[PDB]
Amino acid sequence: LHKEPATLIKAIDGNTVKLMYKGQPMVFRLLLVDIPYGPEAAAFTKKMVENAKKIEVEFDKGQRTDKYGRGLAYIYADGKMVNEALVRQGLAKVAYVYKGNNTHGQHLRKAEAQAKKEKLNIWS
């Protein structure tokens, strides 16, 4: 897997963001992030992407867009994965793997388990 450069265009909600990617505007859905705290998750992703000096998108090895045309990726803000930060903060759950895109699933489930043990936010 490899990180590619992108530019924030705008924050949308906890697991959706609009980016300039290879010179075209594209809506991206954060892989493996399930939002059941919806405003809270939205605000967290919004801050994280808008303060970044560097946004990267990392496709997984399965299908790269969903049926609505959204890119399916891990999104990184200054080197930190947004998908993982949300889960570790207890602001989303880890989704069922979609079509071969599971490369970071174990890593994210470890972050979720930690959030759970700490009883954070959704794990109240």
From Swiss-Prot:
Annotated organism of origin: Staphylococcus aureus
Protein name: Nuclease A
Localization in the cell: Secreted
Residue spans of biased composition, Basic and acidic residues class: 104-120
Binding-site residues for Ca(2+), renumbered to this chain: 15, 34-35
Region span, Disordered: 104-124
Spans through the membrane: none
Catalytic center residues: 29, 70
